[PDB]
Paper text:
Two immunoglobulin (Ig)-like subdomains comprise GG-[name], each having the conserved residues of a canonical E-box motif and internal isopeptide bonds formed between either lysine and asparagine or lysine and aspartate residues.
In [name], the E269 was also substituted to alanine (i.e., double mutant [name]/[name]) to see its effect on isopeptide bond formation. Interestingly, this additional mutation did not affect the isopeptide bond formation in the C-domain.
Residue numbers in the entry: 39 to 302
The structure:
Amino acid sequence: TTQNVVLTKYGFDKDVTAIDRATDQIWTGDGAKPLQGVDFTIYNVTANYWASPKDYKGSFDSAPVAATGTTNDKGQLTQALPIQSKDASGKTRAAVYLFHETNPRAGYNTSADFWLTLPAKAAADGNVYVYPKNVQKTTYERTFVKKDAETKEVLEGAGFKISNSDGKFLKLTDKDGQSVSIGEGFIDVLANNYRLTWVAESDATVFTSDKSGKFGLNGFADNTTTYTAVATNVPDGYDAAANTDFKADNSSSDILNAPSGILP
C-alpha cells in the first residue's frame, strides 16, 4: 500500500514569500511560475528515524534511495511511496521519507530538506501535496552590439569567447554539465536552465553577433567580477575588435570592428 506524493515547485518574485500549504491542499501557485527541471532524491529514512525518533534531525546518512525525480513543465513530480517500511532491525513501521533537492533551477536557491511520516493527510483526490520553497536569487546579464566602426551599422556573424581573471574561458552546459550547441545572439541561460563553467580556451563557448549585432547572456552570479570579451571569428574585411573588459551589470555596450584598410 502506497500513497502518491505530488511535489510542486513554484517560483515567486524575490520579495514574496508564499504561506505554507498543508498536504491536503491543492494549490495552483496563484502569483507564481512553475519551475521545471529541478532534481530531487527521496530518501527512505525509516531506519534512521526509528533508531531514535526524538533524536531525528533529518539525517539521510546510509538511507536507501526511495526514488529520484525531476520537475516537469507544471513544476511537478509525482511518486508512489510505501506507507510502511522496515526499521534497521527488520520490524515494520510507519515509513519516513526525506526530500532532498540535488539540482536547483538556474536563478533559484535550493530548498531546505524536509521529511514526513506516512500515511499523511491527503487531499480529496487521495494525493499528498508538498510545496518546497525555492527562493529566487538575483542574477546579472550583459549584452554587446557588434558594429562597423565606420558606418556604425550592426554587424552579424562576429564570434567571441569570454575569459575571467584566471585566464579561463566560459563554456555553457545544460543542467547536467553536458555540452550544448549555442547559436547566435543573446543566450537566455535562465530560460534554458543552463550553467556557466570555466574551461580551457579551446573548449569554450563561442558567442556570435546575430542579425541585429547582438550577443551576450544572462545568469551571471555577480556584478563585481571583471570578464573580457575576446574576438575569435572576425568578419572578412574587418580588423579584429580590441578586447573588451566588462562586468555583468545588466548594460548593453557597443564593440567596434574597423574595416581593414587597403592602401594604393
